[PDB]
Amino acid sequence: DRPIFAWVIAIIIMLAGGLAILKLPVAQYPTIAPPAVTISASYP
Amino acid sequence: FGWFNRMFEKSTHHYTDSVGGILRSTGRYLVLYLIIVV
Amino acid sequence: AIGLLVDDAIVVVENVERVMAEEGLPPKEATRKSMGQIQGALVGIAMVLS
Amino acid sequence: DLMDKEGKGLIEATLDAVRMRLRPILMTSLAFILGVMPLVISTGAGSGAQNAVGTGVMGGMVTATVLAIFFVPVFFVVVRRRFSRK
Amino acid sequence: LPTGVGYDWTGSYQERLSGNQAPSLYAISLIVVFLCLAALYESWSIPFS
């Protein structure tokens, strides 16, 4: 169709997505195990 | 009233001719634009 | 905002006011082929104001 | 719009364009400065924040139309930017 | 200063005000404004005006 208007749409994605890589956790596997709390006392 | 007659004059003469008058030149009002930025 | 609000109100109205004189023409269809000249901006200006 | 659908107007489209629309600029911009007017002075204790806002737009709108309809860019631009080469 | 005496801020931006902040905000305000002025325009001249 027309070049510019489309290229401008793709340049949002050059940012936004690239902005997301400088703003969303870079860590390992995401929380998998169902989460649990742990009580812990001590009678010496 | 005056009012209309007035505005129609400025817009025509006065303005538009003085715009083709400046448009004629260029490098004087460009060196002015950069003087503005400084 | 009150300023950047009647600005967008003013252009659509007064661009009819010329097109009803520049080619003396009250009717509906004047309004129509004025947003031929007006609206090309309107969405574009809204994209850069943002 | 004139440069395309209508005729070139190398400089006689840019000129012919404000020949038909100095009205809306100096009608809004005047309406804007007057709506900001009650904040710049007039109110002087109820909220002094009104002074902080209006002072930095009344000042700028004087220099946003008496300049941008004129002298420095907004005519001059399209000329050397669009034309002059390619 | 003497040994065993450091420092730490409180609490004194941690990220605020005119920038730092501002520039990066304006920066993108400039990187976008040009687009939009092309999504309805086309060229390499219109948006510079």
From Swiss-Prot, chain C:
Could you tell me which residue ranges are on the Cytoplasmic side of the membrane?
14-38
Q: So where does this one cross the membrane?
A: 39-50
Expression induction per the record is: Positively regulated by MarA, Rob and SoxS transcriptional regulators (at protein level).
**Top-level division of the source organism's lineage:** Bacteria
Residue pairs linked by disulfide bridges in the UniProt entry:
none
**Consequence of gene disruption:** Loss of susceptibility to contact-dependent growth inhibition (CDI); inhibiting cells still contact the target.
Compartments it resides in? Cell inner membrane
What quaternary structure, including any partners, is listed in this protein's UniProt entry?
Homotrimer, with large domains that extend into the periplasm, interacts with AcrA and TolC. AcrA may be required to stably link this protein and TolC. Interacts with AcrZ. Part of the AcrA-AcrB-AcrZ-TolC efflux pump.
- Which family is it part of? Belongs to the resistance-nodulation-cell division (RND) (TC 2.A.6) family.
Function comment: AcrA-AcrB-AcrZ-TolC is a drug efflux protein complex with broad substrate specificity that uses the proton motive force to export substrates.
Q: What is this protein called?
A: Multidrug efflux pump subunit AcrB
> What residues of the intact protein does this structure contain?
401 to 450 of 1049
